[PDB]
Design a protein around this nucleic acid. Sequence first.
RNA 1: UUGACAUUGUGAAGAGACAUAGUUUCUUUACUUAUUCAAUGAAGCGGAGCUGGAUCCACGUUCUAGCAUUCAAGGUCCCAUUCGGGGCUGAUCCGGGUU
RNA 2: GCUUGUGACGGCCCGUGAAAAUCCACAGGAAGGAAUAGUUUUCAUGCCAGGUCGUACUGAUAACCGCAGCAGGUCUCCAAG
RNA 3: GAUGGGGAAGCUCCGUUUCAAAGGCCUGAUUUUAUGCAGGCCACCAUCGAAAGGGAAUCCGGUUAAGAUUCCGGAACCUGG
Lengths: 213, 87, 52, 13, 224
Amino acid sequence: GRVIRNQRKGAGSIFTSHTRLRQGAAKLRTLDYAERHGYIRGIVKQIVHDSGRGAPLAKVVFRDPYKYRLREEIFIANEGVHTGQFIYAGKKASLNVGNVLPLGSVPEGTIVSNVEEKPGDRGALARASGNYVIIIGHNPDENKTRVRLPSGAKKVISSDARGVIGVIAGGGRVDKPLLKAGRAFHKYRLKRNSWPKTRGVAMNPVDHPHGGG
Amino acid sequence: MRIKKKNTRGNARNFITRSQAVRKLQVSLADFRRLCIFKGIYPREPRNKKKANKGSTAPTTFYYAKDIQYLMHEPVLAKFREHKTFA
Amino acid sequence: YATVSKTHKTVSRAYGGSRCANCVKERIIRAFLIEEQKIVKKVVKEQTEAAK
Amino acid sequence: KKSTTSWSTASVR
Amino acid sequence: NPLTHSTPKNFGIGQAVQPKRNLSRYVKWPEYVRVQRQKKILSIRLKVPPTIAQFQYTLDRNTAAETFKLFNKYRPETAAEKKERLTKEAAAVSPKPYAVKYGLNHVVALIENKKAKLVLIANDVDPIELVVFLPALCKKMGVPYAIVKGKARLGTLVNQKTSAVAALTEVRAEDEAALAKLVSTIDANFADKYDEVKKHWGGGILGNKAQAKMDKRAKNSDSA
RNA sequence: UUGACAUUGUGAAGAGACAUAGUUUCUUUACUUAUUCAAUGAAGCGGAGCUGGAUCCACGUUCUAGCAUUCAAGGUCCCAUUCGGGGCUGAUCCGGGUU
RNA sequence: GCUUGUGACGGCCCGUGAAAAUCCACAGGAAGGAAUAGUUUUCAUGCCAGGUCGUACUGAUAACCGCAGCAGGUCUCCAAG
RNA sequence: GAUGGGGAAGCUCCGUUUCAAAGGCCUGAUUUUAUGCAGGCCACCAUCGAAAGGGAAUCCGGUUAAGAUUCCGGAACCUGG
Ligand SMILES: [Mg+2]
Ligand SMILES: [Mg+2]
Ligand SMILES: [Mg+2]
Ligand SMILES: [Mg+2]
Ligand SMILES: [Mg+2]
Ligand SMILES: [Mg+2]
Ligand SMILES: [Mg+2]
Ligand SMILES: [Mg+2]
Ligand SMILES: [Mg+2]
């Protein structure tokens, strides 16, 4: 039969992401000697809107430990983080909002965000606005940490894996009705071509398995 | 004609430093000095050292680029290479 | 800006051009105060180590 | 005078 | 000197820029260098069958020096002095020559005919099958043999770049006693001394970090 | 989706057969060298220090939108002092594994 | 008053509304530079040079497409009482 | 959209900085071994893609059957040396 959109989307074509206005990929620093053993201080220079993303982003500038220059990182902004704030990243950083710490260096009940699934993959979990990860517990013998994810799942992660103290800013976004096909249009214009959606029932028997009747 | 780049013409092309001359000749420093003595190549003073050396005031030995290009064709250089192979 | 003299592109102060007067004043104040506080912190730490 | 090869000397000081 | 002051640099984390250090341990070497280093490491790490591991036992420094001292007196005729002999042969129309025998097929044939008084086998032959049968063949034929380090050394012996084998077949009367003493020395130093240890397998050697882990685990098992 | 064979290596323990010396199978538990995944600026890994202080740590960085780059100043030993030049250290050692 | 350019503002967004070439400035100070002599071509004046290709005209109820000198189709600027 | 590589019987396909020894620069009488280059520094990937995006610098008057911010006269400006 004729190919449906569900199968047509795999080839790419007109279904790729609309990435012209993106500020950049939001990642933590590469896990290096400084973050493994001590800490490093960076400064929040600005907090910016990222097109196609609900959560705002924070530009954090660090000093290169091996060469005289500055290094720019794009973090997802946790709520309460402000411009001019000093962010501390490393094993020895303090428990404050915005600081990046290993999951083994935080106590139980700690709320984190932008959490690594594996140490050094630069943030995988709790990145959408208003989301966070809870530190349920520790297994020091296996160097593991039990955490709870936004979907209610419980996961076991390496304690070397990092996370940002706090909750991703921009929460409560989905509580407001769009009210308008135009607002949905402008929403998906900055994301991808998945709108509007035609029901499979409304289609023909050749078009969709739900078609016909 | 498009805009031409700076530090390419005039003093910057007229003069070549000793390091650049040695690199272009692909010889050692001692062989370069002996070749310059044999051929009578002498160091020169540009009227604008900064224009000749990209704004640096550091003291450098300068030569004529055309003199070094003429030195490229001296058969004593090939004799030096032959001696190195024999050694 | 390549066609004009340096007077048109600068003011006669540190960071003349790149930074304005109030920002320059603020970073002067901050540098001085933080260096003094660093000296104070070093003296305090050495005294605490000696008395420990 | 004229070069027949790519690398020539032609001996003009 | 009141104009010079001491200004130490803090090279700690989050402090002054790190100085230049020796990063030789972290160099991303070219692929051929990485291949040769990892190949030698793999040869060390893997368990080696005895007929290959027997080539890791060679002559000692002194005995190898004496052997090459004897063989350099029988280094073969060069291309220049063969011309001199042929000029002398052309006019006369030469004594019997004494020379080190070389060439794999030639030396294997001499061993099979029981004519080689002493055989030297290079240890670093690749492919190794070219000489892997030679110690057993020499033992079966009763030919004295020694495994030596350096096919390049044997090549210098026979005026070549390399040489997988060398053989002394016939020697002068002013060196027969030296050859017999060298044969007895090789019998005492290489044949009898390494007779049993060449029957074992080699290369069961752990890496540095794996060995440290095993030692730490054994220590934690034995005491707490 | 399930099973078999090949890729496919190394040990230890509990069980077997030559009729109570080591020649090969079944489990159990480990290992790394094959293979596989990921990252990097292949930068700080592993182990040890009669290193230090109290098994743990570096006591080199946490009021502040500053600054941090020219073989590192200094200490010490030489030179033949001359516009400066070398070495040890500052900055522990070892490794046949970039992490 | 019309058109247009600009300024300081205000509203709107689960939309916050290009990149690079190129140019300048600062921080820093490897260095270079004067006493009967140096410095400064970001001040003025003076000298020399700037190649290749396009350039007519229509742009439409007759110069384009629709087998046509076809009531069709085809992007844009200026615009008086 | 090549190269390094990797697929494919193959015409060729993937991918666009990776998985590459991918290239420049500074100092030297290197304490002399006597005619052989020593000590260092910095590091990222071709090429194509806009006559409406970005962008060095020109105006007025006159002139032809048909040219015109291009020619003529006068007056400027930019880039490089
Ligand atoms: Mg229908
Ligand atoms: Mg015209
Ligand atoms: Mg037509
Ligand atoms: Mg037609
Ligand atoms: Mg392609
Ligand atoms: Mg182009
Ligand atoms: Mg344009
Ligand atoms: Mg006209
Ligand atoms: Mg004119």
